[PDB]
Amino acid sequence: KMAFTLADRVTEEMLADKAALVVEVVEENYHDAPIVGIAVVNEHGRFFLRPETALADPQFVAWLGDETKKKSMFDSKRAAVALKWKGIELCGVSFDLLLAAYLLDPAQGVDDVAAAAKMKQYEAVRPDEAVYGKGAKRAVPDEPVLAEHLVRKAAAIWELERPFLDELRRNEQDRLLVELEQPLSSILAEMEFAGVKVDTKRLEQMGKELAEQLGTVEQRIYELAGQEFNINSPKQLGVILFEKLQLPVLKKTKTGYSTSADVLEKLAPYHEIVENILHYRQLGKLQSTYIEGLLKVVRPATKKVHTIFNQALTQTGRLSSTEPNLQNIPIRLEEGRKIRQAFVPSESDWLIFAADYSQIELRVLAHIAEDDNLMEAFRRDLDIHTKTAMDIFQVSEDEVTPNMRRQAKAVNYGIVYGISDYGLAQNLNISRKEAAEFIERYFESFPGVKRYMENIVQEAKQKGYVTTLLHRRRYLPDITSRNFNVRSFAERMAMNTPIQGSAADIIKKAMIDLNARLKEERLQAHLLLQVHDELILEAPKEEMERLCRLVPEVMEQAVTLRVPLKVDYHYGSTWYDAK
DNA sequence: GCGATCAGCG
DNA sequence: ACGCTGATCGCA
Ligand SMILES: [Ca+2]
Query: CA Rg, chain A, in Å?
Result: 26
* Dihedral, A395, A399, A401, A403 alpha carbons, nearest 10: -20
Last residue of a domain, one of A308, A340, A369: A308
- The SS3 assignment for A19 reads strand
A577 C-alpha to ligand 1 centroid (Å): 16
Distances (CA, A) of A426 to A238, A249, A329, A349: 21, 15, 27, 49
- The SS3 assignment for A353 reads strand
- The SS3 assignment for A201 reads helix
Angle at Cα A488 formed by Cα A484 and Cα A489, nearest 5°? Answer: 125
Same domain flag for A390 and A455: yes
Q: What is the DSSP letter of A522?
A: T
Output the CA torsion sign for A459, A462, A468, A471: negative
Last residue of a domain, one of A443, A469, A503: A503
Neighbours of A229 (CB within 10 A): 15
- Residue A180 near residue A509, CB atoms below 8 Å: yes
* Dihedral, A273, A279, A282, A288 alpha carbons, nearest 10: -80
- Residue A565 near residue A544, CB atoms below 8 Å: no
Does residue A171 reach within 7 angstroms of strand C, measured from its CB? no
Going by their DSSP bridges, the two strands A196-198 and A320-322 should be labelled as unpaired
Nearest to A184 by CA among A399, A342, A192, A169: A192
Same domain flag for A101 and A183: yes
Same domain flag for A144 and A8: yes
Does residue A357 reach within 7 angstroms of strand B, measured from its CB? yes
- Any idea which nucleotide's C1' is nearest the CA of A409? B10
A359 C-alpha to ligand 1 centroid (Å): 6
Give strand C nucleotides closer than 7 A to any protein Cβ.
Answer: 1-12
Structural resolution in Å: 2.3
Which CATH number characterizes residue A288's domain?
A: 1.20.1060.10
Distance of CA A398 to the CA centre of its chain: 34
Same domain flag for A4 and A122: yes
Nearest to A324 by CA among A343, A351, A349: A343
- The SS3 assignment for A282 reads helix
**Entry field: residues in chain A:** 579
Q: CA-CA distance, A30 to A82, in Å (whole number)?
A: 6
Does residue A332 reach within 7 angstroms of strand B, measured from its CB? yes
Distances (CA, A) of A332 to A204, A357, A402: 21, 18, 9
Q: CA-CA distance, A545 to A351, in Å (whole number)?
A: 11
Environment class of A462 (CB within 10 Å of its CB; exposed 0-12, middle 13-18, buried 19+): exposed
Which method was used? X-ray
Same domain flag for A344 and A492: no
Max Cα separation, chain A?
79
Same domain flag for A313 and A167: no
Q: Can you point out the beta strands (E) in A265-385? A: 304-305, 308-310, 320-322, 343-344, 350-357
Q: CA-CA distance, A352 to A541, in Å (whole number)?
A: 9
| Strand arrangement, sheet containing A567-572 | A526-530, A534-540, A350-357, A567-572
Q: What is the DSSP letter of A5?
A: E
- Residue A196 near residue A302, CB atoms below 8 Å: no
Q: CA-CA distance, A78 to A514, in Å (whole number)?
A: 23
At residue A300, what are phi and psi to the nearest 5 degrees? -65, -30
- Residue A506 near residue A315, CB atoms below 8 Å: no
A532 C-alpha to ligand 1 centroid (Å): 9
Same domain flag for A77 and A216: no
- Any idea which nucleotide's C1' is nearest the CA of A361? B10
Nearest to A35 by CA among A146, A176, A189: A146
- Residue A503 near residue A493, CB atoms below 8 Å: no
Q: Which long-range contacts (CB under 8 A, 24 or more apart) does A272-281 make?
A: A272/A224, A273/A221, A273/A224, A273/A225, A273/A240, A273/A241, A273/A245, A274/A241, A274/A247, A276/A217, A276/A220, A276/A221, A276/A224, A277/A221, A277/A231, A277/A237, A279/A217, A280/A214, A280/A217, A280/A218, A280/A221, A280/A231
A204-224: b or e for each residue (b if 16 or more CB lie within 10 Å)? eebbeebeeebeebbeebbeb
Distance in Å from C8's C1' to A281's CA comes to 11
Distance in Å from B7's C1' to A412's CA comes to 21
Distances (CA, A) of A212 to A205, A284, A341: 11, 11, 20
Give the list of residues 6+ apart from residue A318 with CB closer than 8 angstroms, or none: A500, A501, A504, A532
Does residue A383 reach within 7 angstroms of strand B, measured from its CB? no
SS (H, E, C) A63-125: HHHCCCCEEEECCHHHHHHHHHCCCCCCCCEEEEHHHHHHHHCHHHCCCCHHHHHHCCCCCCC
Q: CA-CA distance, A157 to A125, in Å (whole number)?
A: 10
Does residue A207 reach within 7 angstroms of strand C, measured from its CB? no
Q: CA-CA distance, A70 to A522, in Å (whole number)?
A: 26
Same domain flag for A382 and A485: yes
Which domain does A83 fall in, by range?
1-193
Same domain flag for A367 and A460: yes
- Residue A492 near residue A350, CB atoms below 8 Å: no
Same domain flag for A93 and A150: yes
At residue A455, what are phi and psi to the nearest 5 degrees? -65, -40
Give the list of residues 6+ apart from residue A35 with CB closer than 8 angstroms, or none: A23, A24, A25, A51, A55, A82, A83, A86
A568 C-alpha to ligand 1 centroid (Å): 8
Distance in Å from C5's C1' to A410's CA comes to 16
At residue A473, what are phi and psi to the nearest 5 degrees? -130, 145
Does residue A316 reach within 7 angstroms of strand B, measured from its CB? no
Which CATH number characterizes residue A48's domain?
A: 3.30.420.10
Distances (CA, A) of A122 to A47, A65, A302, A367, A384: 20, 30, 44, 41, 51
H/E stretch holding A421: helix A421-428
Does residue A120 reach within 7 angstroms of strand B, measured from its CB? no
Distance in Å from C9's C1' to A346's CA comes to 33
Which CATH number characterizes residue A532's domain?
A: 3.30.70.370
Does residue A482 reach within 7 angstroms of strand B, measured from its CB? no
Residues β-bridged to residue A267: none
Give the list of residues 6+ apart from residue A123 with CB closer than 8 angstroms, or none: A114, A117
Q: DSSP assignment of A145-169, as one string?
A: HHHHHHHHHHHHHHHHHHHHHHHHH
Same domain flag for A273 and A320: no
Does residue A572 reach within 7 angstroms of strand C, measured from its CB? no
SS (H, E, C) A469-507: CCCCEEECHHHHCCCHHHHHHHHHHHHHHHHHHHHHHHH
Same domain flag for A267 and A316: no
Euclidean distance between the first and the last CA atom of chain A, given in angstroms as a whole number:
59
Domain count, chain A: 4
Does residue A238 reach within 7 angstroms of strand C, measured from its CB? yes
H/E stretch holding A536: strand A534-540
Does residue A318 reach within 7 angstroms of strand C, measured from its CB? yes
Q: Which residue is nearest to nucleotide B9 (CA to C1')?
A: A532
Nearest to A261 by CA among A249, A275, A240: A275
Q: CA-CA distance, A570 to A376, in Å (whole number)?
A: 27
Distance in Å from B9's C1' to A85's CA comes to 30
Does residue A232 reach within 7 angstroms of strand C, measured from its CB? yes
Distance in Å from B7's C1' to A24's CA comes to 33
Last residue of a domain, one of A308, A325, A343: A308
Does residue A68 reach within 7 angstroms of strand C, measured from its CB? no
Distances (CA, A) of A313 to A106, A109, A183, A492: 7, 7, 17, 20
Distances (CA, A) of A81 to A191, A208, A402: 10, 34, 40
